[PDB]
Amino acid sequence: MLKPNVAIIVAALKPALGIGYKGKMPWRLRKEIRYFKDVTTRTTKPNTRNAVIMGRKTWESIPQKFRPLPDRLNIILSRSYENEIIDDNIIHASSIESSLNLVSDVERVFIIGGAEIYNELINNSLVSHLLITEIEHPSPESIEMDTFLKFPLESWTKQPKSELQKFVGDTVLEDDIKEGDFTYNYTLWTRK
Numbered sequence: 026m027l028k029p030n031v032a033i034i035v036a037a038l039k040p041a042l043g044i045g046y047k048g049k050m051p052w053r054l055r056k057e058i059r060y061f062k063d064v065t066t067r068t069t070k071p072n073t074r075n076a077v078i079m080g081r082k083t084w085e086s087i088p089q090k091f092r093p094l095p096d097r098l099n100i101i102l103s104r105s106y107e108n109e110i111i112d113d114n115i116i117h118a119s120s121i122e123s124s125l126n127l128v129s130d131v132e133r134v135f136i137i138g139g140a141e142i143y144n145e146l147i148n149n150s151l152v153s154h155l156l157i158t159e160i161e162h163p164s165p166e167s168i169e170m171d172t173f174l175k176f177p178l179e180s181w182t183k184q185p186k187s188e189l190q191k192f193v194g195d196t197v198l199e200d201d202i203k204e205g206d207f208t209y210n211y212t213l214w215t216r217k
């Protein structure tokens with residue numbers, strides 16, 4: 026692919042946009058996980074797939090039996106990786122852009138974590154879309170958190186729901202989804 030449009034997909038706790046604690050996610054939101062699966066997997070035309078790109082630490086944190094994430098081309102970035110096509114589902118590379126130069130028959134490209142990767146690529150002009158699950162909690166300070174998004178959202182525009190719906194096709198978007206003490210909403214952002 027040449028100059029693909031890329032989407033960041035992430036779930037973060039407002040207002041500080043925390044996304045992790047000591048290498049783990051600070052929640053397990055079952056509908057959110059299913060949303061992540063559906064959006065990263067779905068294609069708009071047949072006989073294509075999407076790519077998911079992640080940092081080496083996030084890859085290693087997926088239990089080895091459940092990686093690669095099924096039905097998507099998985100790309101793993103490490104500063105120690107030379108370019109290598111491991112198999113039809115796994116690519117090793119050292120830049121998002123060079124990894125995608127190696128690829129054909131891919132529709133959408135999603136960045137799926139983690140914090141270091143997100144915080145670099147937010148300032149990469151290939152990234153055109155942010156799919157942010159905005160999570161709220163009555164006492165967010167009580168949530169164990171040490172890892173945060175650094176997203177300059179002043180340069181971004183949160184789109185109306187109709188734009189997110191168009192992006193996700195027939196995927197059902199429930200509003201104010203509650204699981205335990207967490208309430209969340211799916212959002213779409215584009216560059217100003």
Ligand SMILES: NC(=O)C1=CN([C@@H]2O[C@H](COP(=O)(O)OP(=O)(O)OC[C@H]3O[C@@H](n4cnc5c(N)ncnc54)[C@H](OP(=O)(O)O)[C@@H]3O)[C@@H](O)[C@H]2O)C=CC1
Pocket residue numbers: 034035036037043044045046047048049050051079080081082083084102103104105118119120137138139140141142143145172
């Ligand atoms: N809430 C959410 O939606 C999500 C949250 N997370 C959270 O993120 C946290 C993990 O993130 P983090 O620890 O930062 O790890 P990352 O998954 O971001 O991996 C960081 C690694 O990626 C590689 N890397 C980073 N930048 C580059 C570059 N420019 N070129 C090549 N390789 C690069 C490096 O690998 P190497 O060291 O091998 O060089 C680096 O050590 C966890 O707490 C997890 O819970 C993760 C996904 C989703």
Ligand SMILES: COc1cc([C@@H](C)C#Cc2c(C)nc(N)nc2N)c(OC)cc1-c1ccccc1
Pocket residue numbers: 034035036057058061079083084086087088091136137138158
């Ligand atoms: C979907 O499953 C996983 C997803 C992840 C990461 C890649 C993620 C994510 C993610 C989610 C859940 N929602 C959103 N909105 N964006 C994301 N990037 C993971 O990180 C170590 C681990 C798992 C995982 C998979 C199988 C078993 C256990 C954990």
